[PDB]
Amino acid sequence: FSTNFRDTVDILVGSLTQQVSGWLQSLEAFSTTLLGQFLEDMEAYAEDLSSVSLPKLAALLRVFSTVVRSIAYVTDVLYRVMRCVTAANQVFFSEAVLTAANECVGV
């Protein structure tokens, strides 16, 4: 199961979002190491600013939130990193990524 979820996660970054989210949540360490890649990708996307990559960032935030909800000192650092990476992109002002960011921060 450690490698079967990779295909689902990759396919979920493409209106089947609710279906894939439900399947992933019902399907259930590896999560700790998996979130690192998502954080690195988000940081790289934000650093690449200095404009079609926005949907990718939005999808990444949504899959990250779904993975987090699928299930104590690293939570604060990861939340701060996410808030900083989201606030860094203050040029395009995309609402789609903002909603996903708000949802992930709330979760």
Coordinates of N, CA and C in Angstrom, one line a residue:
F1 N 0.8 -1.2 0.0 CA 0.0 0.0 0.0 C 0.9 1.3 0.0
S2 N 2.1 1.1 0.4 CA 3.1 2.2 0.4 C 3.3 2.8 -1.0
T3 N 3.2 2.0 -2.1 CA 3.4 2.5 -3.4 C 2.1 2.6 -4.2
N4 N 1.0 1.9 -3.8 CA -0.2 2.0 -4.6 C -0.9 3.4 -4.5
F5 N -0.7 4.1 -3.4 CA -1.3 5.4 -3.2 C -0.6 6.4 -4.1
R6 N 0.6 6.1 -4.6 CA 1.3 7.1 -5.4 C 0.5 7.4 -6.7
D7 N 0.0 6.3 -7.3 CA -0.8 6.5 -8.5 C -2.0 7.4 -8.3
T8 N -2.7 7.1 -7.2 CA -3.9 7.9 -6.8 C -3.5 9.4 -6.5
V9 N -2.4 9.6 -5.8 CA -2.0 11.0 -5.5 C -1.6 11.7 -6.8
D10 N -0.9 11.0 -7.7 CA -0.6 11.7 -9.0 C -1.8 12.0 -9.8
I11 N -2.8 11.1 -9.8 CA -4.0 11.3 -10.6 C -4.8 12.4 -10.0
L12 N -4.8 12.6 -8.7 CA -5.6 13.6 -8.0 C -5.0 15.0 -8.3
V13 N -3.9 15.2 -8.9 CA -3.3 16.5 -9.1 C -3.6 17.0 -10.5
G14 N -4.6 16.4 -11.2 CA -5.0 16.8 -12.5 C -5.7 18.1 -12.6
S15 N -14.2 16.6 -12.4 CA -14.8 16.9 -11.1 C -14.7 15.7 -10.1
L16 N -13.8 14.8 -10.4 CA -13.6 13.6 -9.5 C -12.8 13.9 -8.3
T17 N -12.6 15.2 -7.9 CA -11.8 15.5 -6.7 C -12.4 14.9 -5.5
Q18 N -13.8 15.1 -5.3 CA -14.4 14.5 -4.2 C -14.3 13.0 -4.1
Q19 N -14.5 12.3 -5.2 CA -14.4 10.9 -5.3 C -13.0 10.4 -4.9
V20 N -11.9 11.0 -5.5 CA -10.6 10.6 -5.1 C -10.3 10.9 -3.7
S21 N -10.8 12.0 -3.2 CA -10.5 12.4 -1.8 C -11.2 11.4 -0.8
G22 N -12.4 11.0 -1.2 CA -13.1 10.0 -0.3 C -12.4 8.6 -0.4
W23 N -12.0 8.2 -1.6 CA -11.3 7.0 -1.7 C -10.0 7.0 -0.9
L24 N -9.2 8.1 -1.0 CA -8.0 8.1 -0.3 C -8.2 8.1 1.2
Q25 N -9.2 8.8 1.7 CA -9.5 8.9 3.1 C -10.0 7.5 3.6
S26 N -10.8 6.8 2.8 CA -11.2 5.5 3.2 C -10.1 4.4 3.1
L27 N -9.1 4.7 2.3 CA -8.0 3.7 2.1 C -7.3 3.5 3.4
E28 N -7.2 4.5 4.3 CA -6.5 4.4 5.6 C -7.5 4.3 6.7
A29 N 5.3 8.2 9.9 CA 5.6 7.1 9.1 C 5.9 7.6 7.6
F30 N 5.1 7.0 6.7 CA 5.3 7.4 5.3 C 4.8 8.8 5.0
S31 N 3.7 9.3 5.8 CA 3.2 10.6 5.6 C 4.2 11.7 5.9
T32 N 5.0 11.5 7.0 CA 6.0 12.5 7.4 C 6.9 12.7 6.2
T33 N 7.4 11.7 5.6 CA 8.4 11.8 4.5 C 7.7 12.3 3.2
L34 N 6.4 12.0 3.1 CA 5.6 12.4 1.9 C 5.3 13.9 1.9
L35 N 5.0 14.5 3.0 CA 4.7 15.9 3.1 C 5.9 16.7 2.7
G36 N 7.1 16.2 2.9 CA 8.3 17.0 2.6 C 8.4 17.3 1.1
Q37 N 8.1 16.3 0.3 CA 8.1 16.6 -1.1 C 7.1 17.6 -1.6
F38 N 5.9 17.6 -1.0 CA 4.9 18.6 -1.3 C 5.4 20.0 -0.9
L39 N 5.9 20.1 0.3 CA 6.4 21.4 0.8 C 7.5 21.9 -0.1
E40 N 8.5 21.0 -0.5 CA 9.6 21.5 -1.4 C 9.0 21.9 -2.7
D41 N 8.0 21.2 -3.3 CA 7.4 21.6 -4.5 C 6.8 22.9 -4.4
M42 N 6.0 23.2 -3.3 CA 5.4 24.5 -3.2 C 6.4 25.6 -3.1
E43 N 7.5 25.3 -2.3 CA 8.5 26.4 -2.2 C 9.1 26.7 -3.6
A44 N 9.4 25.6 -4.4 CA 10.0 25.8 -5.7 C 9.0 26.6 -6.6
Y45 N 7.8 26.3 -6.5 CA 6.8 27.0 -7.3 C 6.7 28.5 -7.0
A46 N 6.8 28.8 -5.7 CA 6.7 30.2 -5.2 C 8.0 30.9 -5.6
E47 N 9.2 30.2 -5.5 CA 10.4 30.8 -5.9 C 10.5 31.1 -7.4
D48 N 9.8 30.3 -8.2 CA 9.9 30.4 -9.6 C 9.1 31.7 -10.1
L49 N 8.5 32.4 -9.2 CA 7.8 33.7 -9.6 C 8.8 34.7 -10.2
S50 N 9.9 34.8 -9.6 CA 10.9 35.8 -10.1 C 12.0 35.1 -10.9
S51 N 2.8 32.5 -16.1 CA 1.9 32.4 -14.9 C 0.8 31.4 -15.1
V52 N 1.2 30.2 -15.5 CA 0.3 29.1 -15.7 C 0.5 28.0 -14.6
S53 N 1.5 28.1 -13.7 CA 1.7 27.2 -12.7 C 0.7 27.3 -11.5
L54 N -0.1 28.3 -11.5 CA -1.1 28.4 -10.4 C -2.0 27.2 -10.2
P55 N -2.6 26.6 -11.2 CA -3.5 25.5 -11.0 C -2.7 24.3 -10.3
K56 N -1.4 24.2 -10.7 CA -0.6 23.1 -10.1 C -0.5 23.3 -8.6
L57 N -0.2 24.6 -8.2 CA -0.1 24.9 -6.8 C -1.4 24.7 -6.1
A58 N -2.5 25.0 -6.7 CA -3.8 24.8 -6.1 C -4.1 23.4 -5.9
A59 N -3.8 22.5 -6.9 CA -4.0 21.1 -6.8 C -3.1 20.5 -5.7
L60 N -1.9 21.0 -5.6 CA -1.0 20.5 -4.6 C -1.5 20.8 -3.2
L61 N -2.0 22.0 -3.0 CA -2.5 22.4 -1.7 C -3.7 21.5 -1.4
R62 N -4.6 21.3 -2.3 CA -5.8 20.4 -2.1 C -5.4 19.0 -1.7
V63 N -4.5 18.4 -2.5 CA -4.1 17.0 -2.2 C -3.4 17.0 -0.8
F64 N -2.6 18.1 -0.5 CA -1.9 18.1 0.8 C -3.0 18.1 1.9
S65 N -4.0 18.9 1.8 CA -5.0 19.0 2.8 C -5.8 17.7 2.9
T66 N -6.1 17.0 1.8 CA -6.7 15.7 1.9 C -5.9 14.7 2.6
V67 N -4.6 14.7 2.3 CA -3.7 13.8 2.9 C -3.6 14.0 4.4
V68 N -3.6 15.3 4.8 CA -3.5 15.6 6.2 C -4.8 15.2 7.0
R69 N -5.9 15.4 6.4 CA -7.2 15.0 7.0 C -7.4 13.5 6.9
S70 N -6.7 12.8 6.0 CA -6.9 11.3 5.9 C -6.6 10.6 7.2
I71 N -5.7 11.1 8.1 CA -5.4 10.4 9.3 C -6.6 10.5 10.3
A72 N 4.8 16.8 18.2 CA 3.7 17.8 18.1 C 4.4 19.2 17.9
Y73 N 5.6 19.2 17.5 CA 6.4 20.5 17.4 C 6.6 20.8 15.9
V74 N 6.4 19.9 15.0 CA 6.6 20.2 13.5 C 5.4 20.8 12.9
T75 N 4.2 20.8 13.6 CA 3.0 21.4 13.0 C 3.1 22.9 12.9
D76 N 3.7 23.5 13.9 CA 3.9 25.0 13.9 C 4.8 25.4 12.8
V77 N 6.0 24.7 12.6 CA 6.9 25.1 11.6 C 6.3 24.9 10.2
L78 N 5.6 23.7 10.0 CA 5.0 23.5 8.7 C 3.9 24.5 8.4
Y79 N 3.1 24.9 9.4 CA 2.0 25.8 9.2 C 2.6 27.2 8.8
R80 N 3.7 27.6 9.5 CA 4.3 28.9 9.2 C 4.9 28.9 7.8
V81 N 5.5 27.8 7.4 CA 6.1 27.7 6.1 C 5.1 27.8 5.0
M82 N 3.9 27.1 5.3 CA 2.8 27.2 4.3 C 2.3 28.6 4.2
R83 N 2.1 29.2 5.3 CA 1.6 30.6 5.3 C 2.5 31.5 4.6
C84 N 3.8 31.4 4.8 CA 4.8 32.3 4.2 C 4.9 32.0 2.7
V85 N 4.9 30.7 2.3 CA 4.9 30.4 0.9 C 3.6 30.9 0.2
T86 N 2.5 30.9 0.8 CA 1.3 31.4 0.2 C 1.3 32.9 0.1
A87 N 1.7 33.6 1.2 CA 1.7 35.0 1.2 C 2.8 35.6 0.2
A88 N 3.8 34.8 -0.1 CA 4.9 35.3 -1.0 C 4.3 35.6 -2.3
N89 N 3.4 34.8 -2.9 CA 2.9 35.0 -4.2 C 1.8 36.1 -4.1
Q90 N 2.3 37.4 -4.1 CA 1.4 38.6 -4.0 C 1.5 39.4 -5.3
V91 N 1.6 38.7 -6.4 CA 1.6 39.3 -7.7 C 0.4 38.9 -8.6
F92 N 0.1 37.6 -8.7 CA -1.0 37.0 -9.5 C -2.3 37.2 -8.8
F93 N -2.4 37.0 -7.5 CA -3.6 37.2 -6.7 C -4.7 36.2 -7.2
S94 N -4.4 34.9 -7.1 CA -5.3 33.9 -7.6 C -6.3 33.5 -6.5
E95 N -7.6 33.5 -6.7 CA -8.5 33.1 -5.7 C -8.6 31.6 -5.5
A96 N -8.4 30.9 -6.6 CA -8.4 29.4 -6.5 C -7.4 28.9 -5.5
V97 N -6.1 29.4 -5.6 CA -5.1 29.0 -4.7 C -5.4 29.5 -3.3
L98 N -6.0 30.7 -3.2 CA -6.3 31.3 -1.8 C -7.3 30.4 -1.1
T99 N -8.3 29.9 -1.8 CA -9.3 29.1 -1.1 C -8.7 27.8 -0.5
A100 N -7.8 27.2 -1.4 CA -7.2 25.9 -0.9 C -6.2 26.2 0.2
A101 N -5.5 27.4 0.2 CA -4.6 27.7 1.3 C -5.4 27.9 2.5
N102 N -6.5 28.6 2.5 CA -7.3 28.9 3.7 C -7.8 27.5 4.2
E103 N -8.3 26.6 3.4 CA -8.7 25.3 3.9 C -7.6 24.5 4.5
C104 N -6.4 24.5 3.9 CA -5.3 23.7 4.5 C -4.9 24.4 5.8
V105 N -4.8 25.7 5.9 CA -4.4 26.4 7.1 C -5.5 26.1 8.2
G106 N -6.7 26.1 7.9 CA -7.8 25.8 8.9 C -7.7 24.4 9.4
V107 N -7.5 23.4 8.5 CA -7.3 22.0 8.9 C -6.1 21.9 9.8

